[PDB]
């Protein structure tokens, strides 16, 4: 809504990026955004600042200021947040934890020992939402209202994907599209890398491969085909590129990735387990 | 220009890429190009029928149509195409190949021996302009004027980013960004999987992978930061992402990027060798 | 069945596993009898030559009398003993003859050399097919000769189709085939029988291990051939999330087998280049 | 001339199993299409959007299905055949004959659940695949306790009317589950490289895909149709010197049976780890 | 307390190691930045930038530099090389050293292009690394066939300011090339890694950053100081049973040795091949 007043805890780079995103979008204005942080120094707090977001040192500070109160810390300081500012949580206040792995039922547990029915969403997101790209899925929690599932879907679908899951799909989430971007910016290095061995500038060839991977995945996002229907369109029968697959299949490229989500997933479930 | 002409000799995969990007773009409209194929039953031309792009059996119909006139056939067939409309050539009329590794020097060879100043350029762009995200490169012939260049970059930036390089560059851009959505496709499938492999619905791993690579490489293509500081942005300390990230690099995934740009670079060097 | 009545002669100058192959499949089709295929070897000791005399085939020492009993001539002999074929029955090759080269590698052009010595006009067709024909399930394709007639090529269409699929291709296509569907089928052998010792493996009994390896194989074949989809599509549609299938799927993915796939296409096209360079 | 006149079948799960099946039962003429009915939680599936074009029974309510139903497939994921089991378990009646197509599920668990609300439950438990669609399927099944003798030759007579189809003791089950359950997408892989290794040395990918996939089904039905030994056919292709036996080695070098051999295991240990698991 | 009164620098080039050896030689104390003249075909690059404000007289024409200095400084790519001594090769004088810093490009080759404008010119060739941006660059140089004993020392002095420098025959400079040329990319690499390593195990990225570099630095000075073998100085560190010799382990597994080895040639044959290409 417009009326709205949103909180972060925690002012890392996701908080910038969803503030950031939010604003540009257009459905939050930027005075109506609050951000604390233990570190005033950041350079992420910095920014914020410049945007016109208002700062405090004082988590109870931006429970109180906010409506949704986003939770953007490490999974490790979850537990200590909801020890401060538990108390200070209030019938009206949906609480939004992005952090990786840390379950709706813990949260609603330290919550429930202060007031009976916490609001609790639990989020995967990713930093491309800075750019309005990104990638969210979210749960609701026990005592979510209805509107609360479809409010937090109008404000993260501002700023790029946005869809419900049940809880336990998230772990997996994180490890493709929570550590996705990572995936993609060390490709982007490495395909730089590929173009200035073969001769290009640099900044060429971050540009275009940069640019040739953003067009490929909006090609497939607008797509109907499988992804290898698409890439059999531009594989030329013993061309340039068919030449390039082979020896990404001799390296097992397809298996690195599948290792990579699933390293990422499963090290989602410890950092959760490592709170019970 | 709005009187402009353009045909395709082609019309595969490129030739409906290029148009469907360039009417969307409202740089062209679909009546002032003309597409000719070999094989009239293609699916591709079905397609652009139904865009109302012309289209005709014989190649020097295109060519008496069109006053730009993209090439867009495989490259052991350019030196055929040359020989049989190389007559029909005119003075008004700019030759843009689009074939994987065939020069300019070699194309205005096989022209000059009918009329003496052919207007060529060599261009380098991939699928994506059909989503007007192409990543596009091109090289100016002996004969080209400086109008014919800058009119050029006007068609093709309008499906996506193009400059003017060195025609040295253009067989290292191919295999940067000319192959570069294949390794995309690949990688979203592969991804796809791990997803998959961790309890996501193949529908929802594919959207998500997907968007997490177009919001990536949207944010480095807005951002003046290098790609590891990225990368260093999002891969939280013990998290989920820095563990994904070892796994990567343990398959030497930066490497086997590496291994495809080379590849697809060499076999495109071969592809113009093979020609003279 | 209308080629049946053409009563054809067929010949097969060599005759091992493929002219058995061949010659089986005929025959399993209807479209030839057996005693109208005659096949000649310098051995009438091998095994194939033992099962051709069996099912009827006729069997001659002489390489001459195979090519005037023949109206369509199958080249079924190594690649290096091409040249020395043609040396030996060029001068027997007569206008009616349809001669068709199953070699690996060897180029029309290359035939047509030697054969144009004698007669001006040879009427040649390199094919490449393989061995599953004896089930009528082969996969053939076939480019035609300088000389040979638009009904040569729809003759041999329709002889090549009744032992499975067949389709005329450019000659410069045929190496790439050899190295996919010519050689295929020992990929798939290879498969079959590492997928038996899978199944052996986790505990099953060798014989049903077999069977039902080759049965998935062949039900997974068909399905793409009558289905439009891709075959990640396919792959997609048998892969539940979290389940057996992709934690499978994923194992290949770490041993490269895909790459192997593609490295063993390769080296069997490559070696059928260096097959023809060699002679 | 097979036609079961007497029997409704139903499918619990509207996914790709039960439009297989659903498909390749209609296609071999065993069934009526609107003698099937089928239930499932999204109605908005594209095999569920599929099955109303055959003509199949489409509810949302597992009961309707149960009701309709002699022969019910629980064709659902195996962590949900516990629920499935939960909320019909009421309405499973002597009639019924329960056929679970669940990865990994036992009998064992399933007669224990429905024996709750009646006793003598009559349970099967089938694995099968995909291909079932084109007729040209690899089933196999364990009767339970309280199968009769005529339910297992029933349920062979169906599943026989769309592939390959044998009893096994149930302790196999898995192991099948890592061989033919999932073996067609190795074979789905391994036409997606072979057509990518054709066109790398210059075919139409049409052309390539339609040839592997040939020379695939050609190489299953020569092995299915012969008493041979696999290595045996892969001599006789393997000309001394030639391209074949230059290709085997690169595969040899490879490891490529190890891979295969590692596929099923994997797919395997993981079926007896679903079961576990619920 | 160095400094070149008489001197005046030139760099055809206006790049990384342009700037990077300027903005040494500035802080060495050794050359006022005014007293230096770079050109470059695109004057709108970074270090273009960067030279500006540093006072560094800057020029689009490579004629301008060369009518400005003593000391030229050829800082471009090898294939430009033979484009830029073509384009300026009659201005070069008897006053003028050349010192090429292009990897590969011989003294052979470039005495060829100018000895046919004027003879004996004075060519030095020398290899050098960015570090000399603070003062701790590595570099080799080798005199030509007229360059004078004076050249020598005077450019083994400049050199020096910004670190070690050495003369060497030139046959060893495209050994050298590969490593201390490239060396601090290797440095670079490995410091992102060894971050990332800290990274996995708890560190924030830019603790791990500093005692990453700081680690590299230390161990380097320490085998500079030391008359010690290498492996002596690790052996120092690796406590019997301890992490460090666990480590240890895991990088011989992976061959790390032989993998610098592969650096360090890969580099030097691809420097021959600049030659040869040229
Ligand atoms: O994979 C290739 O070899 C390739 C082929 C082309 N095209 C399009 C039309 N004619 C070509 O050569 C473009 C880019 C690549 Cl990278
Ligand atoms: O790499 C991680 O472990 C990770 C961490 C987060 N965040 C942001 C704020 N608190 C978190 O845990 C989000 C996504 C991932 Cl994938
Ligand atoms: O890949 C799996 O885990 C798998 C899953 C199934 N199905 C179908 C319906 N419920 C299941 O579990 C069947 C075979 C396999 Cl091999
Ligand atoms: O493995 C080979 O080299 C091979 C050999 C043949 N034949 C049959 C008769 N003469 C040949 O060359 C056919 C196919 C292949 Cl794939
Ligand atoms: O390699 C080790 O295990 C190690 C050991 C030590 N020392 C010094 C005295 N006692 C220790 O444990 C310090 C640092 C490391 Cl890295």
Redesign the interface.
Same mark, same amino acid.
């Given at each position: 809504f417009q009326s709205m007043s949103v909180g972060f805890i925690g002012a890392g780079?996701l908080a910038f990026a969803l503030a950031k995103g939010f604003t540009a979008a257009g459905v939050l204005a930027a005075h109506k955004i609050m951000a604390s942080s233990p570190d005033m120094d950041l350079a992420t707090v910095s920014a914020l600042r410049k945007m016109g977001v208002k700062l405090t040192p004082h988590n109870k500070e931006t429970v109180q200021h906010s409506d949704v109160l986003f939770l953007a810390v490490?999974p490790h300081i979850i537990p200590f947040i909801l020890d401060e500012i538990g108390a200070d949580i209030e019938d009206r206040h949906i609480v939004v934890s992005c952090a990786?792995?840390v379950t709706i039922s813990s949260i609603e547990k330290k919550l429930s020992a202060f007031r009976p029915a916490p609001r609790v969403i639990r989020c995967m997101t990713?930093?491309?939402?800075?750019?309005r790209?990104?990638?969210t899925?979210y749960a609701t929690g026990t005592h979510a209202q209805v509107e609360d599932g479809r409010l937090m879907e109008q404000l993260l679908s501002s700023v790029?994907?946005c869809?419900e899951?049940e809880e336990?799909?998230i772990?997996?989430?994180?490890?493709?599209?929570?550590?996705?971007?990572?995936?993609?910016?060390?490709?982007?290095?490495?395909?730089?890398? #590929? =173009?200035v061995?073969?001769?290009?500038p640099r900044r *060429?060839?971050?540009?275009?491969?940069?640019?040739? @991977?953003?067009? &490929?995945?909006?090609?497939?996002?607008?797509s109907e085909?499988?992804?290898?229907?698409?890439?059999?369109?531009?594989?030329?029968? #013993? =061309?340039?590129?068919?030449?390039?697959?082979?020896? *990404?299949?001799?390296?097992?490229?397809?298996?690195? @990735?599948?290792? &990579?989500?699933?390293?990422?997933?499963?090290?989602?479930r410890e950092?959760q387990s490592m709170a019970d």
């Open positions: 780079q490490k990786a792995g990713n930093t491309p939402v800075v750019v790209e990104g990638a899925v790029g994907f869809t899951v336990d799909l772990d997996a989430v994180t490890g493709l599209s929570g550590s996705g971007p990572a995936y993609a910016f060390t490709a982007l290095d490495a395909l730089a890398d #590929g =173009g061995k073969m001769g290009l *060429l060839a971050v540009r275009l491969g940069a640019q040739a @991977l953003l067009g &490929a995945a909006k090609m497939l996002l607008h085909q499988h992804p290898g229907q698409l890439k059999d369109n531009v594989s030329s029968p #013993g =061309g340039a590129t068919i030449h390039a697959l082979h020896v *990404l299949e001799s390296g097992g490229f397809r298996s690195l @990735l599948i290792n &990579a989500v699933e390293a990422s997933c499963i090290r989602t950092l």
